[PDB]
Symmetry: D4
Subunit: 202 residues, 8 copies
């Protein structure tokens, strides 16, 4: 009567949509420090579980600016779709081609801005039957109101709202799978947890 | 399961409901500066995509006051329905006649106050089978609490909660349709984006 | 698909649940000034439309305290069900008997605290087929978090979330029905609107 | 047609998931003072109605830390499942065995963090047909945003969002069942209510 | 050496500066409900101690609007200085004449907006050696930031920042001077205190 | 140019002013849970350092209510001055004599409400040459705005604004004076610190 | 003792410091809409009173970006000091030369960021005996905390904290000097005031 | 009258007081992410300008925990004073000896918690004639209220309130001294500025 459709590290792909230097300037519903940390945390997680990753940008040869250096340094062979025109990434045939090429049913998505560059392909992907998991604290927009409206629209469509930590834990399932490696991610992106690790080590 | 019913510039109409000088005094869930900019942004979008526009007021010959000058000056040829009595604009026969005369299926709506002058005709239009897109940051009310209640009541009815930027982007689809013209709108109503444009130009 | 079940002044009853002198001390999700004004506003509306009203209190001979004086004075002929024990007012046979005696299908409810004394009979009434309209700004509780949880639980059951102003406007329908009388209510409970009325009068 | 599935003191069990000294350091969406009180309030309620209670921890021999002393001391006969690995408590067979051994259909659940250690077994329990009641103010996580996303994910699955006070009142049903005893709980965890009791006593 | 220059009911006068219907719409650093109550609370206090009162307006024959009806009705023989031009009330000779005619050394001042219509005559009066007491919660302005700046400029000049309740209490000194009369003021403007009074009476 | 006048456990007395069951209902600038904890923390500290303590109430045979039980239970033999009339405790001769009987130079003060029952005797005590230390988080009032006004008036007078934790640390000076005894206070009133102690203990 | 040193339109100069496209991205203590409006409001005022204006930029040929076009287009004959190196504008000899060349004693200053590009020359100018008026709502920085610290450092030095509206009123003194002209500024930068003007005009 | 005593890179020393893993858990007036970045930003600055640096801890062999790893790794030759007992670092003779041995007049100070471990030695140092510069965003405490109280006490003693960015810029004076080197610090600790640098590089 209910199915817990949870993230599986063998059934998931990660979509980084338009984390560009210019567009990040528009993000005001998260502080710059927390937002940078959250996006990098999701990125470390995508790497850690060796999930197929897709990078895409919107009009990067204009004021929107280049993709943040970390994402390129980190996934140097991930499909990189520079969209010259299409705002909705799902309207770009090369992007959709890359998504389906992964053969993944679950789509983990984060980007800028939430109400547009994330919501639009989320709604399109849901229409095509994909399970979409939105990393909400790795997605930014103009203000808390715009964010809440975007959440309402995406939940109404059946998207699952999460955060980089809950995404990581649902993928990881069991601490004993890799204690040092997974713990390094938590320590590196949760200063409060890093402190616990240091106190515990004495 | 889910169908992404997105804005089409050939199937949509814009409704400005009761942006009056007096009633705007009641809006406290947005700062006066951000709200004026948001209402003006939606207006530029309505002009830019050649959408049929409808203006309506409630009891403008009383304390509710005249329609704001920007809306009258920008749409001097749009149908203007001054409602002497009916609080729900949909209870006014002239208003519904003008809406149906546009022949549009999608209704983009914004106004004051959100819980009444927007919510009531939204619910009425949804009952008559229209697809309603609520511009949440161009609609104001007494406080965030009343707003959240109005949102809940509208989403329960199947309204799509959006914002002027996401409305504009879903209408535009592709940057290459009109780069300068659309960029002018974003630049004129997103100071953060205007700064990006200026830096890019040197 | 969707049906706009809106308040009708001939099909509605008002339930004031446990606005007691002691319990009001627990309301911290509204300022005392705004909350007192909102409850009195709802009372004026019920009186203005001559709606059948029911008053009920919970353990008033204890720390919960007496019903606030304004409610007793404005509705001296309303059914007054003092519940010595039952926390859910719907578990009281005298209260339910009084509700059905009104013969009303729509129930307008407000009270303290929101998550219990309002939510419980709201959920019970919805189960018995009543259309329930919750006046959210005339219902108080411990904090915004508790309030949001109550909203989530009540909307999930099909309650309609509103506020005293939208309640008033949906009942009144047309300004011309009684301009001075209804305007008196707005003037008396919306200081910003009283200011408009005074400026307009010069 | 809505059915009001309310808590029954003979059909409910309480699950305390990972209220550990280390993990509590991660909770920032509640103040430490209010969060401690809220968890202890839930504990007093579980003791008061003699509800079968289950305690569980996650990797307590690490930085996550030991279970807080109060829960251990207040439920000395409760099943205590120390999970060495599984992040989702429902993936632990000893935990699930203990839950089903109570023979209770309704699960009252609280823990840290909300988006993971509460949400994951909540979704799992719902999948196995349990009615789940989430004590939201006795569950903590990193920030209000992550909390809201967890709420969205849990309501979409049919979990009921509540708080310790509403849990207590729905369990208690009638004040006359135990005036002194139930009032002691409210007095002990609602400082405002303790004050009412003291004034009333003079 | 510090001297506690406290309010004396025989050496104080009250100045209401520009509480006009139009200007009040500019006040956003207080909710409309709490601000109306606070200004009326201050007015009740001025009445209770028979303090010499001065009313003044700024360009009331324009958009600024008339003085609120409550103030004219409550001090009908108090000096009423309608300033056609001077923004700083102290630049108006009739106003200064009326102040000095009271022969009072202590000046209690409140008005709209705080940073201008209150701050300017406050700074001027301080220059002339008057002891100035600013009722901060009966003075409004555009936003909290502007208010804090206004406070900073006034404390730097030696103004004493207070609120209507502390003003009332410093004037009253002893409860036994008039228990019923003074308690009536607190009950009428402190809903929480009204609740205490009602519970105490049973 | 500056002297660090810090608390000396042989030169200080603690004044609890009007922590009464009724008046506490007026406190809205702190949550009930954090405020109760802070007042009790200050109280444990006064006992721990064996400081002469004075309890005083304002009109306790009325709606103001009795002194909170914890204070009487902990300081049953402390001077208790029940003021029937004087709002400023310093205008009560019995209170002042009880203060001077201590022979202490430093006065540590906390109470309700901050802008009156704390501020007034604070300003009076400063006038008589006492060094006054205000425990800001153990003093409550109507809202943060009124609080900020009271702080401004007190610092201008030379009061030192502190909190219960800094009061204790300045009194204690050295951890090694009593590690367990002082640690019990921190553990008992700082849940985050209690958690540290528990993790450290494994 | 105290002297009310108020702005005189014949003794004041305006300093716009580093309102550059890049640096504006760092301003998060104001929304972009309100901040853009405030800076332009200050600009309109300087133009309106024909105050000598100085524009200066910091390393504009780098990431800091060009001066915003509005400032350039409204003060085409103002001194433009592009500082390649000096962070403190007062460390630039050309800038100081231009300031003294105006022969103005009162300095009205605004810029980005507040704690550095405004604070540093503010403190330097105060050291040289200038009276400095800081337009707080036309100066931006990283967050409210940094802002408050900057205010603290500047007030301690004797700077007068103001906002663009109070600056305008203190320069203007009298409404009758230019009703149309001055009202145009208020209407153009205070939307609520524009609404009053429109309502008044019918 | 006023002297601008600004930081000189040849007359300043940096004091890191008690940034310990356990104690950092008490910091709730900053998010963990921004606070870690701020503390690390100050450390990069201390190193960049080759400032004499002093590290000190409080009871690090208890629940307070070890000094955070970043500080020890960065400054292996800095004086490290582990205080077993004294809460005020200035009461430790080794600490005072280490400070005076630097021969610096200006003290840049940061630590945990603000109201005690920073405030106490700040007040002591001010008493001995040092110029103290408090890095407010690299100092944390329990909540914003306690923070504001600590600021008041420090400013009253003549402390200068600052932030790491303003500290860096006042030390740096001129961009051209080291463009690349200083830009690395800003890029590394101001995500928004890193974005500007990347956009500029294209
Ligand atoms: Cl494309
Ligand atoms: Cl009509
Ligand atoms: Cl009953
Ligand atoms: Cl396990
Ligand atoms: Cl005049
Ligand atoms: Cl007395
Ligand atoms: Cl230069
Ligand atoms: Cl020591």
């Amino acid at each position: 009567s209910f199915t817990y459709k949870r993230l599986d590290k063998n059934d998931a792909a990660v979509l980084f949509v338009d984390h560009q230097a210019g567009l990040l300037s528009l993000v005001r519903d998260f502080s710059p420090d927390e937002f940078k940390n959250n996006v990098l945390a999701l990125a470390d997680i995508a790497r850690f579980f060796n999930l197929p990753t897709i990078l895409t940008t919107s009009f990067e040869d204009g004021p929107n600016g280049p993709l943040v250096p970390e994402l390129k340094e980190m996934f140097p062979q991930a499909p990189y779709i520079a969209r010259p025109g299409n705002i909705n990434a799902w309207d770009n045939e090369d992007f959709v081609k890359a998504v389906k090429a992964t053969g993944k049913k679950q789509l983990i998505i984060a980007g800028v801005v939430t109400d547009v560059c994330v919501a639009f392909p989320t709604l399109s992907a849901l229409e095509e039957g994909f399970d979409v998991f939105v990393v909400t604290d790795a997605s930014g927009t103009f203000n808390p109101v715009v964010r809440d409206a975007a959440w309402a629209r995406m939940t109404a469509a059946g998207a699952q709202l999460m955060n980089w930590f809950s995404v990581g834990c649902e993928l990881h399932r069991d601490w004993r799978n890799d204690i040092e490696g997974f713990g390094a991610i938590l320590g590196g992106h949760l200063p409060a947890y890093a402190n616990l690790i240091q106190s515990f080590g004495t």
